[PDB]
Design a protein around this ligand. Structure first.
Ligand SMILES: *[C@@H]1O[C@H](CO)[C@@H](O[C@@H]2O[C@H](CO)[C@@H](O[C@@H]3O[C@H](CO[C@H]4O[C@H](CO[C@H]5O[C@H](CO)[C@@H](O)[C@H](O)[C@@H]5O)[C@@H](O)[C@H](O[C@H]5O[C@H](CO)[C@@H](O)[C@H](O)[C@@H]5O)[C@@H]4O)[C@@H](O)[C@H](O[C@H]4O[C@H](CO)[C@@H](O)[C@H](O)[C@@H]4O[C@H]4O[C@H](CO)[C@@H](O)[C@H](O)[C@@H]4O)[C@@H]3O)[C@H](O)[C@H]2NC(C)=O)[C@H](O)[C@H]1NC(C)=O
Length: 32
């Protein structure tokens, strides 16, 4: 990711989707 802006918000949004939908079933959280 050249962005680290559009991309980082995308990854944070994806992380939030996963942990909300399911408690814990391989949450992404690739957000250093
Ligand atoms: C996360 O990552 C993603 C990755 O995708 C990022 O998305 C991408 O982001 C970039 C950068 O913003 C985008 O680039 C864009 O590039 C165009 C290039 O020009 C196009 O539009 C022209 C419009 O007309 C202008 O030019 C004519 C001719 O000189 C003038 O008469 C007009 O008045 C305008 O100035 C067009 O002319 C170009 O060519 C076409 O038309 C001509 C003329 O008819 C033909 O000859 C050609 O053949 C052809 O048909 C071309 O289509 C920029 O225009 C975009 O916006 C910049 O320029 C605008 C106009 O000046 C200005 O209003 C904007 O503010 C902006 O200006 C900034 O950037 C300029 C370019 O570097 C600088 O010169 C300027 O100083 C200023 O810094 C835009 O830059 C990508 O499209 C976009 N998507 C993809 C898929 O790549 C995303 O942004 C990232 N997000 C974050 C948060 O990090």
């Amino acid at each position: 990711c050249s962005n680290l802006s559009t991309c980082v918000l995308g990854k944070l949004s994806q992380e939030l989707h996963k942990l909300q939908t399911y408690p814990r079933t391989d949450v992404g959280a690739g957000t250093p």
